[model samples]
Target: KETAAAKFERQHMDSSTSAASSSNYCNQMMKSRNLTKDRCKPVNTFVHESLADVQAVCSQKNVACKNGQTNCYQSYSTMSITDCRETGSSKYPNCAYKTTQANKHIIVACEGNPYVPVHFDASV
Candidate 1:
């Protein structure tokens, strides 16, 4: 099934909306996306690049993920991204996040036929 890729898209991909200037971007997005339904995700990233561009990263130079997994690939061009980090005061059902926007080359884990991003590994 398309479970992994679907989840990846839901969690990371955001090509259209420039969530850049919004103070409540992460707060609203995280909750709206159900990422804080039970427990908040401590850290997460949203990429502001086209889906096809992100998918093409699967064919980029291979690299190791944080856990030393070799299925990860690094993008050649830098991309705009927003990093969301949970604040210490954050609590379930009322999770809060601090957003940091930047432009960097992204790394992602890809797998299966018609390979696509399954995880957002890092931004370099």
Candidate 2:
């Protein structure tokens, strides 16, 4: 079994050569107005984590507070094991093993949105 840090490093860090590459793409997107470059742009990408593994890690890390107060660590969205099994993609093939590897981008319209802030856009 791969540890969270190990898996995170394997899938993200090992593949990149620079700090920028190793850093979260979502953060990169934020730095780059690339989100507004084209009419169609991605706003963010969500990474998935298995609820069971999330719980186990929280327990092991003692992240939970007393008085049954939900800990800040417990914020994972769960999907049924059967649902994962139905997907043929290796990213979410089955339930026997928990996956914290699936990711996807989200696009949002930022045109004329006063609430949206602007910042310097970085380039690679």
Candidate 3:
């Protein structure tokens, strides 16, 4: 079974690729990462930063998640990332996405002994 931290990494980590350079990056990545399984994911974000860098955010400033859980933390540094949004024409079994590149501080939920990211809350 995949832990939430591992699932977060699988869905959001992308240190090697630059989304700005590839227009179809989300279209390919979203599918390859298994986010399109059984249905299309409406939105997702990929962090172009190392896992360690993201994990370290757990020790940063604490904030409230959308659900009001106080375990979320905001990144101390702005990072390269890509936001993937499902297009209006997208459908199950054929997920299509529009990739938008940006550099921003991200908010993530952390948990467990080592304190790693388990959920991506937002970016600013």
lDDT digits (tens) for residues 20-80 of candidate 3? 4688989999999999998899999999988889899999989999899999999989999
Weakest 10 consecutive residues, lDDT, candidate 3? 15-24
Off by over 4 Å in 1: none
- Runs off by more than 4 Å, candidate 2: 1-24, 27-55, 64-124
TM-score of structure candidate 1: 0.94
**Which portions of model 3 miss their true places by more than 4 Å?**
none
Clashing pairs in 1: none
lDDT value for candidate 3? 0.92
For every candidate in turn, the CA RMSD to the true structure comes to: 1.4, 18.9, 1.0
> How many backbone overlaps does candidate 3 show?
0
Taking the tens digit of each residue's C-alpha lDDT, what string does model 1 give over 28-121? Answer: 7787767888899999899988899999999997999999999999999898898889999898777999888889999999988989999999
- Which lDDT value does model 3 have at 85? 98
Give Cα distance to truth, residue 80, candidate 3, Å: 0.3
Arranged by TM-score, best first: 3, 1, 2
| TM-score head-to-head 1 vs 3, winner | 3
Task: For candidate 2, give the lDDT of residue 42.
Answer: 26
